[PDB]
Design a protein around this motif. Structure first.
Motif, PDB file in Angstrom:
ATOM      1  N   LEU A  74      81.922  54.053 168.965  1.00 13.34           N
ATOM      2  CA  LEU A  74      80.570  54.534 168.709  1.00 13.34           C
ATOM      3  C   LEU A  74      80.529  55.951 168.155  1.00 13.34           C
ATOM      4  O   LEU A  74      79.453  56.406 167.750  1.00 13.34           O
ATOM      5  CB  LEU A  74      79.731  54.446 169.983  1.00 13.34           C
ATOM      6  CG  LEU A  74      79.698  53.017 170.553  1.00 13.34           C
ATOM      7  CD1 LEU A  74      79.119  53.025 171.947  1.00 13.34           C
ATOM      8  CD2 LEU A  74      78.906  52.102 169.644  1.00 13.34           C
ATOM      9  N   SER A  77      78.737  56.075 164.838  1.00 12.83           N
ATOM     10  CA  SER A  77      77.308  55.850 164.725  1.00 12.83           C
ATOM     11  C   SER A  77      76.717  56.864 163.760  1.00 12.83           C
ATOM     12  O   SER A  77      77.161  58.014 163.700  1.00 12.83           O
ATOM     13  CB  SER A  77      76.645  55.995 166.096  1.00 12.83           C
ATOM     14  OG  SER A  77      77.230  55.158 167.080  1.00 12.83           O
ATOM     15  N   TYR A  79      73.850  59.205 163.464  1.00 13.78           N
ATOM     16  CA  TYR A  79      72.719  59.857 164.107  1.00 13.78           C
ATOM     17  C   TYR A  79      71.858  60.529 163.047  1.00 13.78           C
ATOM     18  O   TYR A  79      72.374  61.341 162.267  1.00 13.78           O
ATOM     19  CB  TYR A  79      73.172  60.892 165.133  1.00 13.78           C
ATOM     20  CG  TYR A  79      73.470  60.320 166.501  1.00 13.78           C
ATOM     21  CD1 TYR A  79      74.595  59.538 166.706  1.00 13.78           C
ATOM     22  CD2 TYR A  79      72.628  60.573 167.592  1.00 13.78           C
ATOM     23  CE1 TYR A  79      74.874  59.008 167.937  1.00 13.78           C
ATOM     24  CE2 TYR A  79      72.904  60.042 168.831  1.00 13.78           C
ATOM     25  CZ  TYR A  79      74.039  59.264 168.988  1.00 13.78           C
ATOM     26  OH  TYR A  79      74.344  58.726 170.203  1.00 13.78           O
ATOM     27  N   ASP A  87      74.430  63.502 170.237  1.00 12.27           N
ATOM     28  CA  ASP A  87      75.576  62.668 169.878  1.00 12.27           C
ATOM     29  C   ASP A  87      76.749  63.078 170.762  1.00 12.27           C
ATOM     30  O   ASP A  87      77.539  63.946 170.395  1.00 12.27           O
ATOM     31  CB  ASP A  87      75.878  62.826 168.390  1.00 12.27           C
ATOM     32  CG  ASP A  87      76.991  61.921 167.907  1.00 12.27           C
ATOM     33  OD1 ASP A  87      77.787  61.393 168.725  1.00 12.27           O
ATOM     34  OD2 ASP A  87      77.087  61.761 166.675  1.00 12.27           O
ATOM     35  N   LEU A 206      70.962  52.839 170.196  1.00 15.06           N
ATOM     36  CA  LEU A 206      71.679  52.549 168.959  1.00 15.06           C
ATOM     37  C   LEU A 206      71.301  51.135 168.498  1.00 15.06           C
ATOM     38  O   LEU A 206      71.363  50.191 169.296  1.00 15.06           O
ATOM     39  CB  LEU A 206      73.189  52.669 169.181  1.00 15.06           C
ATOM     40  CG  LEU A 206      73.705  53.921 169.902  1.00 15.06           C
ATOM     41  CD1 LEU A 206      75.205  53.848 170.127  1.00 15.06           C
ATOM     42  CD2 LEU A 206      73.361  55.172 169.118  1.00 15.06           C
ATOM     43  N   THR A 208      72.434  48.080 166.328  1.00 16.02           N
ATOM     44  CA  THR A 208      73.704  47.570 165.831  1.00 16.02           C
ATOM     45  C   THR A 208      73.479  46.301 165.033  1.00 16.02           C
ATOM     46  O   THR A 208      72.572  45.524 165.330  1.00 16.02           O
ATOM     47  CB  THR A 208      74.630  47.257 166.967  1.00 16.02           C
ATOM     48  OG1 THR A 208      73.996  46.255 167.786  1.00 16.02           O
ATOM     49  CG2 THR A 208      74.893  48.508 167.780  1.00 16.02           C
ATOM     50  N   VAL A 229      75.864  50.922 162.811  1.00 15.51           N
ATOM     51  CA  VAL A 229      75.327  51.473 164.055  1.00 15.51           C
ATOM     52  C   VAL A 229      74.538  52.724 163.704  1.00 15.51           C
ATOM     53  O   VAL A 229      75.108  53.649 163.117  1.00 15.51           O
ATOM     54  CB  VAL A 229      76.439  51.821 165.067  1.00 15.51           C
ATOM     55  CG1 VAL A 229      75.844  52.162 166.433  1.00 15.51           C
ATOM     56  CG2 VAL A 229      77.441  50.688 165.203  1.00 15.51           C
ATOM     57  N   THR A 230      73.244  52.770 164.098  1.00 19.27           N
ATOM     58  CA  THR A 230      72.320  53.889 163.851  1.00 19.27           C
ATOM     59  C   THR A 230      71.563  54.284 165.122  1.00 19.27           C
ATOM     60  O   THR A 230      70.878  53.447 165.716  1.00 19.27           O
ATOM     61  CB  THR A 230      71.266  53.531 162.803  1.00 19.27           C
ATOM     62  OG1 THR A 230      71.905  52.901 161.699  1.00 19.27           O
ATOM     63  CG2 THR A 230      70.512  54.790 162.322  1.00 19.27           C
ATOM     64  N   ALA A 231      71.631  55.556 165.508  1.00 19.03           N
ATOM     65  CA  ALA A 231      70.837  56.027 166.638  1.00 19.03           C
ATOM     66  C   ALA A 231      69.353  56.026 166.281  1.00 19.03           C
ATOM     67  O   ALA A 231      68.975  56.245 165.123  1.00 19.03           O
ATOM     68  CB  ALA A 231      71.255  57.428 167.065  1.00 19.03           C
TER      69      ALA A 231
END
Length: 237
Positions: A74, A77, A79, A87, A206, A208, A229-231
């Motif tokens: 992760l 990811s 952010y 993060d 997150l 996914t 994967v994006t916060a």
């Protein structure tokens, strides 16, 4: 390429600038069947994008490949800028963090995992041990009844102040060949390997997205993974 007013954020972003090579190594034991998996590939944290090829190095895999996806980084990811102070994953690098999970397969067994995620030189390494217990020999897992595909999920992240890290839980939906789904409840905790400080986030999640495929030239048992994967969950407006 990057510019953030916080030097703790700058440190994390600098390590994940560009495209970073990824090595994954797992030793597993499910119901007495030992096995190993090697993985190689690349991550682009700017786009929260991973691509990895995994090979079972002991032969045939005794559990369905999709059950290992969450186990097999992760820190890659994406952010959004207004959330980069949250993060934990990048802020624990290069020394790294430990990721520990118990995954409860509803009406079946559970996976217990421990991983160290850290840099070795330029390479991001994820080294993992997995113990699976109480699986039904003709259930969806050891019966190999899961479809070779993957759904999109939300991984909720909360600070764990006394462990100087994070805790997480989330539910994974595995499509079954009959039409039903097999649920996998993930409990998760991450704590830093180093002793220095880290970013402890506000609550967020997150998003996914994962696609599974095959190398048509590959005769070993294997899985190719594309993952985004994006916060999210904190507003700028």
């Amino acid at each position: 390429h990057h510019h953030h007013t916080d030097p703790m954020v700058s440190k994390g972003e600098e390590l994940f600038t560009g495209v970073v090579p990824i090595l994954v190594e797992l030793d597993g034991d499910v119901n007495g069947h030992k096995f190993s998996v090697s993985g190689e590939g690349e991550g682009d944290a700017t786009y929260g994008k991973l691509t990895l090829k995994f090979i079972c190095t002991t032969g045939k895999l005794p559990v369905p490949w999709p059950t290992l996806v969450t186990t097999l980084v992760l820190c890659f990811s994406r952010y959004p800028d207004h959330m980069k102070q949250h993060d934990f994953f990048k802020s624990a690098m290069p020394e790294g963090y430990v990721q520990e999970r118990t995954i409860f397969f509803k009406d079946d067994g559970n996976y217990k995992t421990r991983a160290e995620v850290k840099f070795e030189g330029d390479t991001l390494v994820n080294r993992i041990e997995l113990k699976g217990i109480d699986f039904k020999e003709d259930g969806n897992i050891l019966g190999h009844k899961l479809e070779y595909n993957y759904n999109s999920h939300n991984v909720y992240i909360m600070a764990d102040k006394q462990k100087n890290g994070i805790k997480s839980n989330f539910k994974i939906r595995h499509n079954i060949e009959d039409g039903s789904v097999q649920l996998a409840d993930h409990y998760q905790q991450n704590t830093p390997i180093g002793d220095g400080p880290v970013l402890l986030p506000d609550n967020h999640y997150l998003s996914t997205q994962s696609k599974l495929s095959k190398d048509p030239n590959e005769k070993r048992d294997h899985m190719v993974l594309l993952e985004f994967v994006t916060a999210a969950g904190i507003t700028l407006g």
